[PDB]
Amino acid sequence: TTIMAVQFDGGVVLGADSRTTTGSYIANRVTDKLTPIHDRIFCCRSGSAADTQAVADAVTYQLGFHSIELNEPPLVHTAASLFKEMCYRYREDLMAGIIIAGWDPQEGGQVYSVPMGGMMVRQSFAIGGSGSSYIYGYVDATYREGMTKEECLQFTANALALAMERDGSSGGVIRLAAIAESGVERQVLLGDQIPKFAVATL
Amino acid sequence: GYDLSASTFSPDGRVFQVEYAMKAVENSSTAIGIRCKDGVVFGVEKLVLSKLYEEGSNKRLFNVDRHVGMAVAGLLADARSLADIAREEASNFRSNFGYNIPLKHLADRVAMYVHAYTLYSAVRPFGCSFMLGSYSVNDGAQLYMIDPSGVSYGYWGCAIGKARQAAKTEIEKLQMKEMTCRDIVKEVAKIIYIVHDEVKDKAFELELSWVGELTNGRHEIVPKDIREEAEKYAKESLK
Amino acid sequence: DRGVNTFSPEGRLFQVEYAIEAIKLGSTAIGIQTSEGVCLAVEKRITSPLMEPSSIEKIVEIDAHIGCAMSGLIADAKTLIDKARVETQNHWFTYNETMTVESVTQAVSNLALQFGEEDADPGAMSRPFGVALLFGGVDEKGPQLFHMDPSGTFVQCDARAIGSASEGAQSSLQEVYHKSMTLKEAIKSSLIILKQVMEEKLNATNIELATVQPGQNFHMFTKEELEEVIKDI
Amino acid sequence: TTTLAFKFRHGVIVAADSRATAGAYIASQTVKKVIEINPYLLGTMAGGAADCSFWERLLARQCRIYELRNKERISVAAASKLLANMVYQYKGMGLSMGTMICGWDKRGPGLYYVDSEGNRISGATFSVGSGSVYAYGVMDRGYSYDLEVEQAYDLARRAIYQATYRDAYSGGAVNLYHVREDGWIRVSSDNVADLHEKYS
Amino acid sequence: TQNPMVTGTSVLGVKFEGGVVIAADMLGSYGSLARFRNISRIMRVNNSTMLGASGDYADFQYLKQVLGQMVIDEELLGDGHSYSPRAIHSWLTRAMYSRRSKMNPLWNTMVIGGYADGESFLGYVDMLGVAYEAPSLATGYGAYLAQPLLREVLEKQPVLSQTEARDLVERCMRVLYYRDARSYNRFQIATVTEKGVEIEGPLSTETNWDIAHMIS
Amino acid sequence: MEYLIGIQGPDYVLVASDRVAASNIVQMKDDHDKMFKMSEKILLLCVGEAGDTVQFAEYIQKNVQLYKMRNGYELSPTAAANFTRRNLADCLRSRTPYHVNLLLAGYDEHEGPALYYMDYLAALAKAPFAAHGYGAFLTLSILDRYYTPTISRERAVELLRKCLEELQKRFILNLPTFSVRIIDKNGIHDLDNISF
Amino acid sequence: SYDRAITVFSPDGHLFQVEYAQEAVKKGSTAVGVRGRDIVVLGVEKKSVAKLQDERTVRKICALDDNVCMAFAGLTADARIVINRARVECQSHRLTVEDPVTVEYITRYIASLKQRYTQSNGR
Amino acid sequence: RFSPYVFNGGTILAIAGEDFAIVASDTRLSEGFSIHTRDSPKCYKLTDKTVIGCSGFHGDCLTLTKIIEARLKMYKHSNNKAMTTGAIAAMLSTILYSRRFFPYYVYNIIGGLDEEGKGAVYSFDPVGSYQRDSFKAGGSASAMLQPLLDNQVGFKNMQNVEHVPLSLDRAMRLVKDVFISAAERDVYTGDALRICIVTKEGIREETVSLRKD
Amino acid sequence: NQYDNDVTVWSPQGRIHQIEYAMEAVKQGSATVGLKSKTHAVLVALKRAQSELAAHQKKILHVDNHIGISIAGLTADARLLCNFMRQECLDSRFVFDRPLPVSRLVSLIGSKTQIPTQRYGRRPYGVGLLIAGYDDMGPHIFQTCPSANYFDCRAMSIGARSQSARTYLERHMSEFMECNLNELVKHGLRALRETLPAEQDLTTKNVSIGIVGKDLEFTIYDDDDVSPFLEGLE
């Protein structure tokens, strides 16, 4: 897997590849790793499919109930806190590297990483999963403060494409999402629409 | 007889044991809260039952979270237990959700706990009413009051205890929406002095607390110098 | 009918007060503390010549340095006595020292108000114990006599009577007791007092007597040793 | 350790060395391995030092409680049984204890071997500990039910001595007790070095 | 934690006349990967007390949550009593010991610094409940690379000024950046005095690479 | 290591067991008894792990005696065998398994003599003769060779003696003495020990 | 589970449930014991006759163990519970002491069972 | 495999005199090949009459000493007198055995006055076995100190020597000598020697410098 | 009436009779007095003796080095509460290595003793305490009641005829803060002596004294040890 999210002024962009593996068999080549947790809050999932699905459904329940009770949209920070509590408490029984991102009216676009082990840290942008290793140098060189939504989308799509080419456990299509006050816009980059970088032939 | 258990309705559909608990709050001396432009102020008429007691003994004003004050009337041991419940709820909320509990949610949660003691022969209703006050830039000023049945509402001004009505009628004279906490403490002290029956109960301490822009959203005791001035204003206004 | 943990308007637990009235239905026991040891003496109260006297046991050894005389509802005393025995042995086990008379009495006295019907385990104590106890022994404070009743109150006494004739016996005790009194004097004094208070004619089978002395372990008087002391009395 | 005991016409002889070790380090030369359970009952210790001390102390507690509740001396059979029932529950948890319970009750002289494996057996003679094999050789060649008292003392002392000589884990002094019908007595304590002088 | 995940490296502390200074880089490493390069490994506990942690960062965030809540609980009472640095160090020793005794440690090594009643406090606690005080401390590779330098200075001059302690800490942080492959040249310095707890950062040390041309 | 044997004739069951209690390289007792009287006409012979063997056999024994006291008559050798089995099997997968091997010998008024074999797994088999322990390996074929169902008790004791002599000759362990008992219509009889 | 306090003190130190239990015993059939020199004997009344009754099934004398028996008077269902409890206990004693119980031992056990049912909730 | 133990070094020693007890220890606290601190004594005052030395795994030394402190107060509250030296020893035995299946990794030596005012030393293994001794060494350098004490205090292996009473002054000289000898050869023992002298008049403290390498 | 047998039954006046009845247990105990200066907190207690040959009931109990209590009411309840206090104190020294502040211990008592006032079949505690302590905020005297309410006091008296002792304490309380120790204990004794029948006097047999302060751990004075304090009521 490769997952990523990026903050912009007014919202966030999220992305993932779509490969599920068992050993080196691809058990799903068009996985949706970006899961809505509330109207404007998504999580990107990596690690165990069973664990991250069970945890996401659980936090979706908790957050929904909390939100009805308060009669307000939930904070992104709350959603991240609930993932953190469950990923930290059960760190010995789960394999879950999560990114929580979304929009709320109080703090705007936010990205949090909850990596394995269950720590939580807010970041400008975050990457995770097995393929993230191959894009540290690329994201560190290419990231600029103040990118627009569109720039965040391209930056995300490029990073993911690079990771997907190299990481055997990542691949398929690139699913993207942008979240802002106005709502959630999702799209899929497939085939020729995935950014392309030549193999370096002699 | 129909009034011995909170698990027995009377034939008219009342729960007398809750009503009796309410009578314990109505026997108590008066506490008031006022919400204003930039915060919430609490004042309590704190009867001193012996000169042997220290200043500050039997406080009726509590910090239940850093941003939330509580003012009580009724049986004081029940109120204190409720202050512990409220504290525990604010603490647990912060642990689970990662931010300071919103006032309304805290009020509703502790109200459901009060409510749970009005259903059963196994336990008795709490003999206390209490107000919760907070302020934040995001939520503004908020003042809630909960009674022994577990009802919880929000208020501009509120009073509990034995001169409740007299206090309300004075609170209604204020245009509190446009006043600051610094102005309102004086008026709180004034009102407690008005409703205090100096013939029947001889000595009292005024207890004051506030939470607002001026304390940066922290619930704090009103400083000693400001309380003394407010007392002096209240006393001379009585004239 | 009210609950077992109900207070009266005087601030007493009804069940404890009633338990205290049950002590008056017991046989008279006497304890006296002297600088040479303590004695405990008890009226047996034989109800038929067909009963075996030696099967009435109202003075028991707690440990080698501590005895106990009981009055009231005797069947209730068993769990108290067993608790005292277990406790002194625990203390020996843990600390390699004998437990003081005061400490034994305290430990037993902490069971007293542990009754009630909706705090506790599926069938815990329903009522207080209908018994009073005199613990007599020797520890590093010297000889010592302690009294305990169903309220869980306990106190050291130079001399004390309990059961049916305790008023009476207590008056004679105030009369005869003195700080410098010998143990032999104390023994005689308590047999004289039992003799007054007892409905039956005192003899060597319808009473029991025990001592504990700085020299010597808990000792129950034999028929023959009782007869000897009875001669003068 | 080497401990032994035997029944004979005049009661039960009980003897032990006094060494303790932590691996090969000699931790003490003055351990008391014969424990006074009551004035008519002794227990011997071999194996884990803390295990033996604790469980035999607990046995002494229980025997004492018993005596108070029942108004009579516990039998050797019943005491040994209490000990076996206590340790049975811990089998497999690594307790190490081998003990002889030695007394004189209504059945006469009594001797039981009890260990942390769960064995409990009555017998005429036993030896327990890393030196037991050496004590058995000497004890077995000299033992008789009709030994005179002083001959029985000599045998026990010599058997433990000889065990201390061969077994690196036994040593110090030989401590000897005699259980008689009216109680045990402590008969002697002889440093193995002073015994060496004597037996040559 | 059975297996630590994102971890922090050394924490340093030294007493000085009027306070205590502690230092810690801002890195969370995931094995060799320098993964989260802007995290604070130092906590202001209350006005008199600060804490820095090596080891598993999630476990540190849990301690921070727990300890932060305890300090809030205590402040609510408004009763004139506060946890001293020594009390917090005691609490922390019990908490780590207790977790060690359930075979489920909090995977951290910590340095507690404080100033109360005219005394500088500096105390260590590790994941096993080993705890003690000393005039200077250093966890992880700092025990090998920084502690020798702290102790050598302290033996010549046991009483340091604030500015001397700060310079000495900076020299130690440089050595760590040279010689610990899990360090990072972005650190915080926290100081506690009469006035309270101040956390400074992000800070960097100057470095010298002249030795790169001294091979032939 | 421990040897048990049983031989059932038309109207009796003969049983025997070694008298050694061993530990490491030494015999610690030479007059050990491995038989437990359950009732007037039932013996349980029990070997296996230390502690388990006595704890198990005495628990069975007390419960069989309890059954007598509650009901005024005794459990049949077959009932007691199945009671024994139920207990062992119910403990097998518990926190407290008992590592014991058994024979149960008895005489019922109506059924006649019975001999039951049980292993630590709690498999129960009724048999005309049987044995447990390493010694069984050297003696079962002696029994197969010479046993007949109508064997008289005098010849059974002879047959038993052949088994025990074969241990003296061929078995590496020193088992010099054996307890011998027989059960019939008149209960349990102690025979002389067979000794070498 | 049912935790009502059933045996409680009344004014003057009476335990009414226990007194009422004693009234039950007084309406039971007469039972007598004599301790001989080297024999002990028990005899008990009746209870009702009735030709159609199987005599075996209603005895009021019962073995507790080989060396101890008992008779009772009072509620026969209650007796059966006590008897069975005592029979269990005789087997524990033999188990852990390897002696038969003394008569005093098992008496003391029965007595303390009976006492506990005067001071335990729900019974 | 998280290990719940680590070895932290430390040597302890106690000597019983006619009317005194000495309990002594070094002040180094170590781990692996490092020194945690040079000023960590291993002796702890329990009463006016009883001092305990503890070495081994420091996390257990701290916990156990805190448990003992609590239990002394519980005793005093329930029995209205301070625990004796002998009762503290017996109680420690049971507290150690309570962790028989997860032991306290601590070697304990108690030194104090018995009920007759005489010196008393009790020495323990980590699971609570113990006895009274005339003197005892424990911890890291115990095998180095013990034989010398056997010889010089016990007079073992010596002919033609008057078995005189041990004076405080000679006991003191011995204690300083053996720790100095131990600092030469045990890497864990060093920095400083702390000596507690328990007598009827109270508990006093001496400290002697040891090698810092 | 129908309202006085259960702690869970409010009366129509807003009272709970069981709690008021429990308070009567304290009013019938023997009197005790507590007072403080700037530096010390003192307890003084009258001990009742059953007969002429009885010792005299303990009234003053050690809780921790910095805390002691005087009791009035059910002795068994007094011990249970005292044992709770002791444990709370040991816990805080175990956890934090410092004394439990006296006002926090008292809060724990209020919270613990409130619980059975609200559950069916439970009863209040039938004991009142005077609590003497010393911590960072100086000396303290607190009072606790069966209602679970508690009070911070300049001085206090509870038990039989305590009104007299309270009057005395109000009369002289302006002197207490500046008193040396001897003066302060004298004041405690004079207050206590007001509670006695005119005939009867303070003696070494009936007076018990407890003191804690800055340089002094909680200490109990009984029997011959009270004589210094009784001589020079001159």
Ligand SMILES: *[B]([O])([O])[C]([C][C]([C])[C])[N]C(=O)[C]([N]C(=O)C1=[C][C]=[C]C(C2=[C][C]=[C][C]=[C]2)=N1)[C]([C])[O]
């Ligand atoms: B990504 O982290 O590489 C991806 C993210 C996930 C979809 C949220 N993870 C995987 O593909 C992982 N695969 C599984 O968890 C998986 C799916 C289906 C079956 C199994 C399986 C597990 C145990 C035994 C048999 C089959 N696993 C993968 C990295 O492990």
Ligand SMILES: *[B]([O])([O])[C]([C][C]([C])[C])[N]C(=O)[C]([N]C(=O)C1=[C][C]=[C]C(C2=[C][C]=[C][C]=[C]2)=N1)[C]([C])[O]
């Ligand atoms: B004998 O069996 O050789 C003897 C018996 C007796 C009761 C002392 N047993 C021992 O010497 C045993 N030794 C110990 O148990 C022992 C002695 C000193 C320290 C320790 C220890 C225990 C736990 C952890 C560390 C050290 N054990 C036997 C030889 O082992």
Ligand SMILES: [Cl-]
């Ligand atoms: Cl991760």
Ligand SMILES: [Cl-]
């Ligand atoms: Cl990740």
Ligand SMILES: [Cl-]
């Ligand atoms: Cl794919």
Ligand SMILES: [Cl-]
């Ligand atoms: Cl109101």
Ligand SMILES: [Cl-]
């Ligand atoms: Cl009486």
Ligand SMILES: [Cl-]
């Ligand atoms: Cl010896």
Ligand SMILES: [Cl-]
């Ligand atoms: Cl018993």
Ligand SMILES: [Cl-]
């Ligand atoms: Cl046997």
Ligand SMILES: [Cl-]
């Ligand atoms: Cl970061």
Ligand SMILES: [Cl-]
């Ligand atoms: Cl912080």
Ligand SMILES: [Cl-]
């Ligand atoms: Cl029962």
Ligand SMILES: [Cl-]
């Ligand atoms: Cl009182």
Ligand SMILES: [Cl-]
């Ligand atoms: Cl009382």
Ligand SMILES: [Cl-]
């Ligand atoms: Cl009140």
